[PDB]
Amino acid sequence: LTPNQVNDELNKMQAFIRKEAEEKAKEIQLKADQEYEIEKTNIVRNETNNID
Amino acid sequence: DLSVRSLHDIVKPEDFVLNSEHLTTVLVAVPKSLKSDFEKSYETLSKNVVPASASV
Amino acid sequence: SQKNGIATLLQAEKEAHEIVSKARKYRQDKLKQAKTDAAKEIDSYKIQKDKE
């Protein structure tokens, strides 16, 4: 109702967007690590067959 | 009369701010009677309604 | 105004872009690390059994 309210909204929404971006980045990094591990395990446990 | 023409030579481009890729600026028009009357109920909008810079 | 709602924005989205660029570079080097680790693991697996 006053420029104080909108000044609060500015920072509020900017904080929401940046924190969502950080959380999404962390989640995708975790999924990247999961892909790392799973692909490594699949490669090793498939190659061991021909090695044997 | 106005509102029947197009906009190709009566306005200039360098007013719509594209500095930010979040704000969107619409160059809407109003009658004379209430030209400044939209200078009161105009700030409930979202983040960064760049103030003290809108005019005709 | 002409500076409060202009420069802070561009700086914030530059920060977001650099964050996601760091993420992408991490993805590239982590995929390199994943494939290299898998290959070295399978080679270490094969060499000892070759000794056997």
UniProtKB/Swiss-Prot annotation, chain A:
Official protein name in the record: V-type proton ATPase subunit E
Subunit structure: Homodimer. V-ATPase is a heteromultimeric enzyme composed of a peripheral catalytic V1 complex (components A to H) attached to an integral membrane V0 proton pore complex (components: a, c, c', c'', d, e, f and VOA1). Interacts with VMA5; the interaction is direct. Interacts with VMA10; the interaction is direct. Interacts with RAV1 and RAV2 components of the RAVE complex, which are essential for the stability and assembly of V-ATPase.
UniProt family annotation: Belongs to the V-ATPase E subunit family.
Chain residue ranges for the region called Interaction with VMA10: 12-31
Sequence segments annotated as region (Interaction with VMA5): 1-13
Gene name of the record: VMA4
Taxonomy, superkingdom: Eukaryota
Part of the full-length chain shown: 8 to 59 of 233
Other observations noted: Present with 16134 molecules/cell in log phase SD medium.
Organism: Saccharomyces cerevisiae (strain ATCC 204508 / S288c)
Curated annotation (Swiss-Prot), chain B:
Functional description taken from the UniProt entry: Subunit of the V1 complex of vacuolar(H+)-ATPase (V-ATPase), a multisubunit enzyme composed of a peripheral complex (V1) that hydrolyzes ATP and a membrane integral complex (V0) that translocates protons. V-ATPase is responsible for acidifying and maintaining the pH of intracellular compartments. Subunit C is necessary for the assembly of the catalytic sector of the enzyme and is likely to have a specific function in its catalytic activity. Reversibly leaves the enzyme after glucose depletion, causing the catalytic subcomplex V1 to detach from the V0 section.
Protein name: V-type proton ATPase subunit C
Other notes: Present with 21114 molecules/cell in log phase SD medium.
Family of this protein: Belongs to the V-ATPase C subunit family.
Quaternary state and interactors: V-ATPase is a heteromultimeric enzyme composed of a peripheral catalytic V1 complex (components A to H) attached to an integral membrane V0 proton pore complex (components: a, c, c', c'', d, e, f and VOA1). Interacts directly with VMA4.
Localization annotation: Vacuole membrane
Species this protein is from: Saccharomyces cerevisiae (strain ATCC 204508 / S288c) (Baker's yeast)
